[PDB]
């Protein structure tokens with residue numbers, strides 16, 4: 001996580017909402033154990049669960065800023 005604790009939208013913890021986060025999203029969503037993920041950063045919509053809603057939020061972030 002960056003300067004907050006966790007950075008929602010930045011799953012690979014690089015400080016930016018990018019297409020690499022999509023990868024990490026999809027890993028955990030598929031049920032993979034993602035080494036080097038910020039597992040808390042996946043809950044982008046802030047519901048407490050890592051779901052496709054967050055994926056859609058991620059797509060929102062990444063489409064806007066950097067893919």
Ligand SMILES: [Ca+2]
Nearest residue numbers: 010014016018
């Ligand atoms: Ca990122």
Ligand SMILES: [Ca+2]
Nearest residue numbers: 047049051054
């Ligand atoms: Ca969520």
